[PDB]
Amino acid sequence: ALRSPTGKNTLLLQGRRTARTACKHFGKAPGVPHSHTRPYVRSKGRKFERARGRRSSCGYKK
Amino acid sequence: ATSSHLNWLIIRNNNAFLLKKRDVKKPFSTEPNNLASVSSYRYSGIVHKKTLGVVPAADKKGFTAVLKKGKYAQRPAKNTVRVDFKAGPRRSLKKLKNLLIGSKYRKDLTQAALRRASAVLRSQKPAPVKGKKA
Amino acid sequence: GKGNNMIPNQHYHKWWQRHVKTWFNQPARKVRRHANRVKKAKAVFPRPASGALRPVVRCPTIRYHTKLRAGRGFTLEELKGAGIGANFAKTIGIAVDRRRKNKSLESRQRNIQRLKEYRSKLILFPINEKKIRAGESSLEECKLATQLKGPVLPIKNEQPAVVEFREVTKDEKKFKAFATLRKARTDARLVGIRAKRAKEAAESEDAAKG
Amino acid sequence: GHVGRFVIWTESAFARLNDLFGTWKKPSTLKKGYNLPQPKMANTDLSRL
Amino acid sequence: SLGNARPLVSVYTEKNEPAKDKNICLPAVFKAPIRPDVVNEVHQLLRRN
Amino acid sequence: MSNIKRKKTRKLRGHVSHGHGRIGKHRKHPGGRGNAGGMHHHRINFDKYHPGYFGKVGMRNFHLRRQHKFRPEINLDKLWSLVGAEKFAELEKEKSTKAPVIDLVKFGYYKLLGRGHLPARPVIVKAKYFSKKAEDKIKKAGGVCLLSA
RNA sequence: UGGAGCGUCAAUAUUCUAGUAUGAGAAAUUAACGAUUUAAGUCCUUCUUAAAUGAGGCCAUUUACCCAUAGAGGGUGCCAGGCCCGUAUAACGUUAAUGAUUACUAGAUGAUGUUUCCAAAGAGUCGUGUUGCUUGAUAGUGCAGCACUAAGUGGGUGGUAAACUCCAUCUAAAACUAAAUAUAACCAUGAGACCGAUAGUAAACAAGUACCGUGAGGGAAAGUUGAAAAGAACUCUGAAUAGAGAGUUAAACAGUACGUGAAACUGCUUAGAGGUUAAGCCCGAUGAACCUGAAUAUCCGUUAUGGAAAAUUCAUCAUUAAAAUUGUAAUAUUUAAAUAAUAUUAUGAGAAUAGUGUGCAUUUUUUCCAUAUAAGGACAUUGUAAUCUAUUAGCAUAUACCAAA
RNA sequence: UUAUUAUAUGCACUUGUAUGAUUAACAAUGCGAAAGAUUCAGGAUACCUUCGGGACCCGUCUUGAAACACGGACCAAGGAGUCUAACAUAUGUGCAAGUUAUUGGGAUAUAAACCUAAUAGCGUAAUUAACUUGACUAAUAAUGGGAUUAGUUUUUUAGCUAUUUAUAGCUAAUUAACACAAUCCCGGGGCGUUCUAUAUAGUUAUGUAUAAUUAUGCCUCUAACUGG
RNA sequence: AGAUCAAGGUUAUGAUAUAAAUGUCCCAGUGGGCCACUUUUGGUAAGCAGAACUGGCGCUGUGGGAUGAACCAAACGUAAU
RNA sequence: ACCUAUACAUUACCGCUAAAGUAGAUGAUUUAUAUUACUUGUGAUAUAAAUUUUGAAACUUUAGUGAGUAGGAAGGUACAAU
RNA sequence: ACUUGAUCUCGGUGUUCAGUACACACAGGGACAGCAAAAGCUCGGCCUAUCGAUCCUUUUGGUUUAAAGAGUUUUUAACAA
């Protein structure tokens, strides 16, 4: 504040706001292929939100 | 840091002399260097060296003992005490405040300062008045 | 449950506010132990506070080719190759334990130096006080020499970070070391069929004679 | 939960804080890696500002 | 942000001895932030223990 | 444990319903106590918001040990906080006293992947595995890898 | 987690070990516990006027009466370190507990490498089938009843069954051990973000008692006169407990619901009133009745002018004593230098107080007294008079427009 | 020619026009009277007294309650949104490719705090059912390019105020850069399923050629790698 | 069809903007309704049922047809005119 | 010709929404006067006098505007112990 | 007359609506073809009906990995229609 209150030769850098990984829970209606949006997992592996709806043979592909 | 506004937001509400009384929006404190009791950011306990106090008398009723600011020669953390030096005007009724207005050359506090004096000598006048009525 | 939020996986069915211990005696469970250990270490000697020798190295699986757990084994078959003397070392205090059959020669060696790391600073207090056969020293008595009773008993403290700022520097850098991990690892998928390639090769020419 | 009691130090005590929180140029000593923390406003005057 | 910035504090004996020759510096913690959001709070939510 | 003037229901008394309705109000469970019936009548708020459920993706991995898939993964782009940070400054003089030696098993990192895009320096590096997109780019960069013991 | 013996390899031995007398140590010490000390005002005056701990004070030593290694508490006629036990370091004392030696009793020479001779090992159980509870355990976890019925380089075990090749690691059906772990019990012990007699254990007390059910068992209600019992003598009246006097106490407006005494009911006296919306209110007044809020140095002035008093860093006042402040100059702490910043060092100006001084009260200074222009009020409620934005009612000076003549 | 209007009023002064939500001169009525205490307005404080209009008597389910719908005799004390469990989001506070003691000991006064080591949670780097494999052609790239762009830089233009006519300010334009953030498309890449390019030569090494695991040559039977 | 130069008026209907522009909590509720005009089925029909398009009632007092949730005026800060 | 509404209009006022202004006071500011630079006349100097404070979470100022159960957030007060 | 497009394959799109899932139609891209001389037409009935999600049982499947020490061989286990 002592130097350049005018802002002559001054740069202004603001970071990203889809940056945080907790901010991809939006906005789901899975029928579209614009679904793309990270469901709330329990934890990775198998038998975790991966049989009925996602893949082919267990009812339907999303 | 020994900084004037750092004397203020930390003593904005957490003061231990500042008793507000449920009603008057947020005023009152009894700090010894208050002199006008709200908080300007200057009417208060030590602002770092624009301090002012007008304390009567202590010897009734002549003197008006007044401190001043203990400036740049002193840090002013405790000193071989130098923060106060207690000049006392006396021997006048309506002349000596001009000596008091001449006493000072950091001129923002001034109008309030003698505004104590124009009633505090009135607070310690009234013995040759108010009397007999026989 | 109303919305896109979190399959609720919580196991409080068994009317699980029944039998719950409250952990409200954490710190008095520190000032019993720390009060009794300094009663369990005032008792013995200027002998240290644990204090056997605890030699063992090298934690089991691919999670650890690095660390080394603090010594419950002590390998009876190491001992005769290192100047002991089993039951004499037991009342010394070794934690001598008669059941571990340590398999590696340098792990045999690893406690061997660790044995000889001790047994020399071990000050040999006399039994008959003629002190003709003890036989390291008796003039290094602990009032004269040590009387230390220090706790920690170090386990070499797991040194390397490092980084090794070392020139090598190669000449045979035309040698693709990655393909070893692809040839030989596919070779493990063939060792059954290669020995079965070996039975169709080494037994095919015997059908020619009849 | 209020600042400021009237505090009285001694000389052997007062020459340990430099150990206990190092300086603006270094880390500290008696704690591993506890650096001296930061200000978010490094001149804090307003009248002389 | 100056390293010492107030580097004169004297040491006194019981008769308050208003000058002594050893004048140690100020250990650069009286420039640290004085912050009443983390002393309002982390006091009383650690008082509770 | 709350500062309860903030907590929603110390200004709600008195409204004369307190926050949960005045027609079909707060009856101890309407829902089905839990997750019923994800196939049955809570269908719509379980697909959407939670597909892939209910079923069997298949490999009955009998008693996984989570050690055989340990492989902690480091990337080639870091690589020089791995070495000393100022130690990179003396490698750009130029002095070709290096490739340096970069152990990974002593670090706590196992398989060198290849996000990377390293500098031009040669490096002698030791990993527990390889990655093909990295190791060719290392081999253009004058350094090569050798598998750790 | 295994053998013994022989030779061989080495060390070696009046020895040491453990037990129980033993006194370490001229009982020296660690404690365990009771134990035992009080450290220092009950100081001089007010209130109490029912009681002082609260109230006033108390040479210095930088303002302590006094102590503090004791200032946590509870008894005390109110809030107490010094009134009292206590609590503070500790001493006193008893019991163990640390055994130097002495005795008796009991045993012991190795480990050490080598190969000779013998290396013997748990029998209705393993395990398979199969039924039935049960498991994280799924062609099986163990535990069981039934049928089976084992081998000796074997038996299990290696989380997918089955042989078949091996490998690794352990050796079934025999048996014991202080610990670090659990504690609404029982026994002595302290502790705080707990309740304050419709709370807290079912009960603060003669709560698992009064009490009902025959039974199993169900279980409530009820704590708190004042500092002291000083509990109301005696007189009068009735046949009495009583009731009036007389008392007692600071209190009886504290007398066995014995502190505080509400709320609903209302008994009483005074005040009003009335055949009404059935009682109620709400809106604005309404007598009655007590109440509330009421005041200050000019029109055409915060003017002219004359009277006194005290005084004086102020005069046109001089010096001197300061301490500062501001603003320079220098030095010292700086992240190589400057700067910034404190600390001391001096200059600078002016102000600034304490003290003296033409006249120092000569025409000054500071407090009271005076007339003069509208004039002693300067304020509140009121009647005007006009102004202003809205706004009604009541007359209109001259136009201009077609046609209608 | 005839009408017309404003411009050609400085200098002081004036209780004086108008202007800062443009209200105010006058007059009357009265002493804040030692204590005492009259006067003028107001004042259902919560009654009572006197009249004018209003007016169903309170919860609650329901389209609807004054309900000829249920609950309410009156009152004092007690009573109903809490506990933890893990999550999500919003948000405060430190820190940062790091973060975390809070299972532990030790320092030392006590349930506090202090100090602390290996781990180990969680992120780092994804997955396919798994075995494998593993994230932009490069010593670099940022939803890789595009348009939407604040802001800064810059081209020159006039321009204004200061103007020294420099130096700047503020215009609008204009030149270029970067394009922040943020949506919208285009990419490329890890991974998988699909054909395909292999007609495959190639490729490297076992092999192979010789020297003696060891050296070099090469064919490449063998592997493996490479194609969109 | 794409990138990139060349020329280009004053941007191209009216009237406004009480401000426009979006991502989370899927945020508490609520998922039983009623009526008049026209338009209108079911029934002979009804203060019944059954609806499409509006306005209103529930949520709403209000001045007016004495009265009356909807009728017709108007949609409710405290005050004088 | 009159008649009445909590509607319409204007003056005050309340809260709410929106917009806008204010911090070198060891200054700013007039009022006079001594002077002066003098530029006719505008300015600087000096004297004398007086006005000049706030949780910038303040303060000034401006317009518009106000029904409400089911329900959500906004500051405000009781009764607690730490 | 002559032939099997009532085909393999990849993902989007139509009406059901929360712009979900099933289903059914529709336009492609790639293939393999079938008739017709060609251009073309054909991814089933001329279009509005002629129909189903996990768990398994079960085929068809690469000639496919998993059985967690190492083979070989059978079994199951998995992915895909």
UniProtKB/Swiss-Prot annotation, chain A:
Compartment list: Cytoplasm
Transmembrane domains' residue ranges: none
Family: Belongs to the eukaryotic ribosomal protein eL18 family.
Protein's name in the database: Large ribosomal subunit protein eL18
Organism: Drosophila melanogaster
Entire-sequence positions represented here: 127 to 188 of 188
From Swiss-Prot, chain C:
Keyword Ribonucleoprotein: yes
InterPro entries, per database record: Ribosomal_eL13, Ribosomal_eL13_CS
Keyword terms, alphabetized: Cytoplasm, Ribonucleoprotein, Ribosomal protein
Assembly and oligomerization: Component of the 60S large ribosomal subunit (LSU).
Entry similarity comment: Belongs to the eukaryotic ribosomal protein eL13 family.
Function: Component of the ribosome, a large ribonucleoprotein complex responsible for the synthesis of proteins in the cell. The small ribosomal subunit (SSU) binds messenger RNAs (mRNAs) and translates the encoded message by selecting cognate aminoacyl-transfer RNA (tRNA) molecules. The large subunit (LSU) contains the ribosomal catalytic site termed the peptidyl transferase center (PTC), which catalyzes the formation of peptide bonds, thereby polymerizing the amino acids delivered by tRNAs into a polypeptide chain.
Protein name: Large ribosomal subunit protein eL13
Organism field: Drosophila melanogaster (Fruit fly)
GO CC, any one term: cytosolic large ribosomal subunit
Compartments where located: Cytoplasm
Biological process, per Gene Ontology: cytoplasmic translation
Single Gene Ontology MF annotation: structural constituent of ribosome
Swiss-Prot record, chain D:
Annotated protein name in UniProt: Large ribosomal subunit protein uL4
Organism of origin: Drosophila melanogaster
Similarity section: Belongs to the universal ribosomal protein uL4 family.
The encoding gene: RpL4
From Swiss-Prot, chain F:
UniProt biased composition (Basic residues): 1-31
A Gene Ontology term for the protein's cellular component: cytosolic large ribosomal subunit
Gene Ontology molecular function, alphabetical: structural constituent of ribosome
Pfam families the record matches: Ribosomal_L27A
Region of interest: Disordered: 1-37
Family matches, as Gene3D superfamilies: 3.100.10.10
Keywords: Ribonucleoprotein, Ribosomal protein
Cited SUPFAM superfamilies: Ribosomal proteins L15p and L18e
InterPro entries: Ribosomal_uL15, Ribosomal_uL15/eL18, Ribosomal_uL15/eL18_sf, Ribosomal_uL15_CS
Gene Ontology biological process terms, A to Z: cytoplasmic translation
Ribosomal protein is among the record's keywords: yes
Family that this chain belongs to: Belongs to the universal ribosomal protein uL15 family.
Identification of the protein by name: Large ribosomal subunit protein uL15
Organism: Drosophila melanogaster (Fruit fly)
